[PDB]
Amino acid sequence: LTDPIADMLTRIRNATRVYKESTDVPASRFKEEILRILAREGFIKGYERVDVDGKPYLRVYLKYGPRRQGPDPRPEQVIHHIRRISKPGRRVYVGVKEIPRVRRGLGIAILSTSKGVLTDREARKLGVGGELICEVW
Amino acid sequence: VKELLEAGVHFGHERKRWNPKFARYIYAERNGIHIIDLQKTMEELERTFRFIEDLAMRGGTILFVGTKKQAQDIVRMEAERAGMPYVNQRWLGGMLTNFKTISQRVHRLEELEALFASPEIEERPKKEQVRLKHELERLQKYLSGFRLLKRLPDAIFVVDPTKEAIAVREARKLFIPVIALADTDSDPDLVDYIIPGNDDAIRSIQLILSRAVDLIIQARGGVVEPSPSYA
Amino acid sequence: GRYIGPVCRLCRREGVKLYLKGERCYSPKCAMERRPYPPGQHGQKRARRPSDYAVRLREKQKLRRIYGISERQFRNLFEEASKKKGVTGSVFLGLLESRLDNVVYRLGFAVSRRQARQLVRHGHITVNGRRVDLPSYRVRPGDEIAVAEKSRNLELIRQNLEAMKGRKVGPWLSLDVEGMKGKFLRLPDREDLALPVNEQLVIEFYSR
Amino acid sequence: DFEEKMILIRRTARMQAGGRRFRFGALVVVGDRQGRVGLGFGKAPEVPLAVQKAGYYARRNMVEVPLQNGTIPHEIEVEFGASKIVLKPAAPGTGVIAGAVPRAILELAGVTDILTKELGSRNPINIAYATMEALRQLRTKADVERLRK
RNA sequence: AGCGCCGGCCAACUCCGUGCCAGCAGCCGCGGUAAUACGGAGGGCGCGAGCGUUACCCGGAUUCACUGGGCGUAAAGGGCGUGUAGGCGGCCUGGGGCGUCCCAUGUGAAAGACCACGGCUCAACCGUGGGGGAGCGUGGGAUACGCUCAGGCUAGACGG
RNA sequence: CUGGUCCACCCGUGACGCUGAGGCGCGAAAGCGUGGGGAGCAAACCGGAUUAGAUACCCGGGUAGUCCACGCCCUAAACGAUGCGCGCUAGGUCUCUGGGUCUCCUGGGGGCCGAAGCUAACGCGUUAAGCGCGCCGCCUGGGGAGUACGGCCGCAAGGC
Ligand code: SF4
Ligand SMILES: [Mg+2]
Ligand SMILES: [Mg+2]
Ligand SMILES: [Mg+2]
Ligand SMILES: [Mg+2]
Ligand SMILES: [Mg+2]
Ligand SMILES: [Mg+2]
Ligand SMILES: [Mg+2]
Ligand SMILES: [Mg+2]
Ligand SMILES: [Mg+2]
Ligand SMILES: [Mg+2]
Ligand SMILES: [Mg+2]
Ligand SMILES: [Mg+2]
Ligand SMILES: [Mg+2]
Ligand SMILES: [Mg+2]
Ligand SMILES: [Mg+2]
Ligand SMILES: [Mg+2]
Ligand SMILES: [Mg+2]
Ligand SMILES: [Mg+2]
Ligand SMILES: [Mg+2]
Ligand SMILES: [Mg+2]
Ligand SMILES: [Mg+2]
Ligand SMILES: [Mg+2]
Ligand SMILES: [Mg+2]
Ligand SMILES: [Mg+2]
Ligand SMILES: [Mg+2]
Ligand SMILES: [Mg+2]
Ligand SMILES: [Mg+2]
Ligand SMILES: [Mg+2]
Ligand SMILES: [Mg+2]
Ligand SMILES: [Mg+2]
Ligand SMILES: [Mg+2]
Ligand SMILES: [Mg+2]
Ligand SMILES: [Mg+2]
Ligand SMILES: [Mg+2]
Ligand SMILES: [Mg+2]
Ligand SMILES: [Mg+2]
Ligand SMILES: [Mg+2]
Ligand SMILES: [Mg+2]
Ligand SMILES: [Mg+2]
Ligand SMILES: [Mg+2]
Ligand SMILES: [Mg+2]
Ligand SMILES: [Mg+2]
Ligand SMILES: [Mg+2]
Ligand SMILES: [Mg+2]
Ligand SMILES: [Mg+2]
Ligand SMILES: [Mg+2]
Ligand SMILES: [Mg+2]
Ligand SMILES: [Mg+2]
Ligand SMILES: [Mg+2]
Ligand SMILES: [Mg+2]
Ligand SMILES: [Mg+2]
């Protein structure tokens, strides 16, 4: 394994696309920070720490829309799109004035800064920049 | 309404040839077949019967659809007890999406009903007579229950959605709610109001359809006691 | 310099009345009241479906021919309006409406924009006292436009101001017929101009 | 009722013993310049019948198009079988910057200011379907907040 | 008052002459006896002291794809291993603060680009003022992430 | 004599990993060198038919070669026309091979049908052509052409 953060985001995307209730991911503190940001913004119901085979895991609880009427009744998504930005093979850093605005304000961007893991609006309010982790809308 | 009588007549059906999406209504595999969770059956039945009663109160119509060899008789009597339209022999493709074109045929049916009576005409050539009598037999065979439909219905009652996927497709396309009795080889997403019961045994279908039509009859101010029960 | 040929054919081609002649435009003998089809041999044949480019080109040409401005000046004005802050269509219309010849046509010292151009060019109009002989001069709010003191006793000017004693100028303008002098109050609004033009079509034309 | 704009007409052929026999396909967009737009693709042996059938299909498939000040609430990128459409909101004076097919679809929907680009395959039918899908996926801020909180 | 154009792209159509000739042509293509495509005429369209043509550069070309492409059958997986340099790398704790980010300061000349005002009757042109601006030096701060040092863990890897 | 690989026990080490420009090794058949061998078959070759002709298809013969040792050559529709590693995403069915609580569950291979998804379509679909990350190789209209020239390799044929 080479990218735990991208792996966790892929687990979330794959579990969400089949309307699962919850998905497990190997635990880590940085992953926990990103999950806390996601929960505060309403993209997931929440997360918790559990043990699988004696190993620490994080269980994420997915959230969806109401049932739809028609040929396709599958509910619409709350996480339409989640993408990793900075990668092991190419690191992406932005200053406070290069902070992207995702989806004209409907989406969010997650930043790793010296003040912690922040949303792009949070970082702009604090006037700080750093590594760009991912974008969610 | 039901009160635990479900177990006596049925619990479920179908072995490993299952649809995994049905897993939310399965309890165990004992002989190789899946046993439906009867508490989930009751919980779904409450909602389904509440919706049925609310629809019957407002005067809407329900189209009872069932064409298996285990329901050609139960469906007919149950739907006739309420004076309700039904499809019993074969779903004609487009019976709902092409309702105007298909219902143009019941006009011919009724016109041929007024043709063979003694008063007016018996002077047609005999070969043309046999042609028209073939046409009348086919129209009566395939449209005897469909005749009661004067408009698109407000719900369709289907006894097996896997077997009757074309009817479910037509209903879902037209935004008409679908109620279904479904065993473990069925897709519950396409069914708005599910009853997770066995739909291949005679007594299970009899119980469900009979009590449903009792509720419909009650929703119009009356109590008709006897139903055709056939061991 | 400018277009100096027949002018009713422009109205007949555009399909609408462009009041480019003055008195004859309101007379029954207006060419748009007798032959409302395009000029030439094929003007009375059934029209084919106009393409998108044709529609935008015709709208732009209508707007340009209303003011009698060359395409180079028109495009320079459009790019200038696009540079300015403000809705580019409204800014462009205001910039077009601020030309001196158009301003003195609206004030009533002339009956047509061509006549207003000849009046301005021939030294008959003064802006804030000093004489201006340039039609393209851009009037700013507050500027006073008037007839030259030695030009007040001119028959054409006398008749023009006589015929305007009843007519009322737009809200963005003020006139003193007795004082023979105008005043440019503000940039005209888009609703104040009765222009048979969709300026969105002109903007989209210049986006190509 | 709605304004009707004819987007595409084409003649297709099939073969039999005897030669080619023709059919006409009409792509038609229907809208009221107030938020409703629909697309229809009708095929018929004759052109006026094809246009009539296309309009009939268009009136039975409409989208709600969440307009705001003549523009769209956010940028959108949509793929339909090797065709790609990019839509982006713009200021009230921009106008509609698009190719003929997206321009017709967006103008009949009530969009007055937008920036668009077509990428990949430029087939008009697939571009029109991609435009319709992109208009279907538009969400306002109220929608997303009703979804998340 | 002129120049180009009028088959599609692309705005603007009829008559006569010719007959795979003469000729046109950026691509597709026109012309072989009823040519909106050649030549002329009438008419029309676009610009206008200009209008066309040739040459070259960017665009359209997401057609070298960082933004922003691909490789089963369209062009494209090396015949297969082993492996050097290089590129990338699991969980927890502390130190450093190199990358990274922030603050102050120096530099980033003038002219040019932008914004405002102003002088030539306007404009081109010019004057004044203000703001930006990648990068680099210096001083200070932060430590989430990458790096680095140290100490642990066993889910990767290897061994019995 | 010797390589790989799988399962069970959960015993030891403690991130020791993945990929890999060059390098090195292996690499069907045919072919080449020196010895041996040679039944059958059989390029070239001879004859008979067939045919307008028949430098073929059919028939009768027939030498290298096919076999062995050693040394070269290094190519292919060397194909799953699909690089390797890791993680995640319904199932059903057939089969090979292990462990168990031997109805059945739990590993590792080989096939068929299919969720979601993907694809221009054909089709793929836990043995991905789906969703992702890391590293390598390759493509940029057809022909000229895998040609020419230069360089390296080979006894040659010829290869890169
Ligand atoms: S008389 Fe009529 S047609 Fe002629 S220029 Fe005046 S408005 Fe136009
Ligand atoms: Mg890197
Ligand atoms: Mg359908
Ligand atoms: Mg396409
Ligand atoms: Mg694609
Ligand atoms: Mg293309
Ligand atoms: Mg045209
Ligand atoms: Mg020609
Ligand atoms: Mg010419
Ligand atoms: Mg001729
Ligand atoms: Mg031409
Ligand atoms: Mg000619
Ligand atoms: Mg440009
Ligand atoms: Mg192009
Ligand atoms: Mg480019
Ligand atoms: Mg491009
Ligand atoms: Mg790229
Ligand atoms: Mg490509
Ligand atoms: Mg391929
Ligand atoms: Mg492919
Ligand atoms: Mg090929
Ligand atoms: Mg290619
Ligand atoms: Mg190929
Ligand atoms: Mg290979
Ligand atoms: Mg190959
Ligand atoms: Mg090999
Ligand atoms: Mg090596
Ligand atoms: Mg290796
Ligand atoms: Mg190698
Ligand atoms: Mg190494
Ligand atoms: Mg530092
Ligand atoms: Mg400077
Ligand atoms: Mg001035
Ligand atoms: Mg200055
Ligand atoms: Mg410093
Ligand atoms: Mg690290
Ligand atoms: Mg360590
Ligand atoms: Mg091996
Ligand atoms: Mg151990
Ligand atoms: Mg230890
Ligand atoms: Mg690794
Ligand atoms: Mg390398
Ligand atoms: Mg070999
Ligand atoms: Mg071989
Ligand atoms: Mg050999
Ligand atoms: Mg030999
Ligand atoms: Mg022979
Ligand atoms: Mg012969
Ligand atoms: Mg032989
Ligand atoms: Mg022989
Ligand atoms: Mg021999
Ligand atoms: Mg092979």
Ligand SMILES: [Mg+2]
């Ligand atoms: Mg290949």
Ligand SMILES: [Mg+2]
């Ligand atoms: Mg490949």
Ligand SMILES: [Mg+2]
């Ligand atoms: Mg490789």
Ligand SMILES: [Mg+2]
């Ligand atoms: Mg298997």
Ligand SMILES: [Mg+2]
């Ligand atoms: Mg299998």
Ligand SMILES: [Mg+2]
């Ligand atoms: Mg298969």
Ligand SMILES: [Mg+2]
């Ligand atoms: Mg498959």
Ligand SMILES: [Mg+2]
């Ligand atoms: Mg398979």
Ligand SMILES: [Mg+2]
């Ligand atoms: Mg592919």
Ligand SMILES: [Mg+2]
């Ligand atoms: Mg190319």
Ligand SMILES: [Mg+2]
């Ligand atoms: Mg070579």
Ligand SMILES: [Mg+2]
């Ligand atoms: Mg050579």
Ligand SMILES: [Mg+2]
């Ligand atoms: Mg040699």
Ligand SMILES: [Mg+2]
């Ligand atoms: Mg070769």
